[PDB]
Assembly symmetry: C2
Homo-oligomer: 135 residues x 2
């Protein structure tokens, strides 16, 4: 029974944003990263949730218009999703795969309680390919 | 031994899409309703032209002095959609398909007629693998 610790991409290699940053900032980072959502970490590096562009747009959709002016005054904490799956550096690999069937990727918190990195579909699929052999 | 795309396929009618003629603010609106990274761009003939994503839209309007949001109500989807995307066919190997979705959350599939017929996705391959276990 393998565990998460082996496929995990360390936090230092993952972009994130602070819960007090303005949406327009998170928007900028998301545009330049290659992920669907981005972890929201406070100053202590404690994971607070994920935020994606759909989350932002969905919160500024007015009846008459997409109120873009708000991205400059709203902080990420008001839009981010807090109810997210979280894996421990030492959870069953079995458990992790189940979760990435539904989520493009899942956040991994170290044993103390700090964001340690992320478990992705690419890294899992990457291995799978080899156990067969590529195009 | 060598399975094939077909079985995993996700019919096109269960997949949201947009036309090269649509305005970005419209594509923007559609992506916000769907749990997909990007959406296929079909002409009315129903023939794949490329993919559009929120990231592609935001990037085409990132300016020096600001993010020019107003241009989303002006530019058509064809001004930013990636016309250079991988494509499949109902008869391509499953090994070729898996290699492609390692780098792509999902890949477009055109039936032998050259019409969009659905999408090959990571979730569906991972769903299968999760059982195989």
């Amino acid at each position: 029974q393998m565990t998460v610790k082996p496929f995990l991409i360390p936090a230092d290699k993952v972009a994130h944003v602070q819960p007090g940053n303005y949406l327009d900032h998170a928007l900028l980072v998301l545009t330049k990263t290659g992920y669907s959502a981005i972890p929201v970490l406070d100053t202590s590096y404690k994971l607070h949730g994920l935020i994606s562009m759909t989350m932002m747009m969905d919160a500024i959709l007015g009846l008459e218009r997409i109120e873009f002016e708000r991205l400059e005054t709203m902080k990420v904490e008001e839009v981010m999703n807090r109810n997210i799956p979280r894996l421990r550096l030492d959870d069953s690999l079995m458990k992790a795969v189940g979760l990435i069937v539904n989520h493009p990727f899942v956040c991994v918190e170290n044993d103390d309680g700090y964001f340690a990195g992320i478990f992705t579909r690419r890294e899992v699929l990457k291995q799978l390919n080899k156990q067969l052999h590529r195009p």
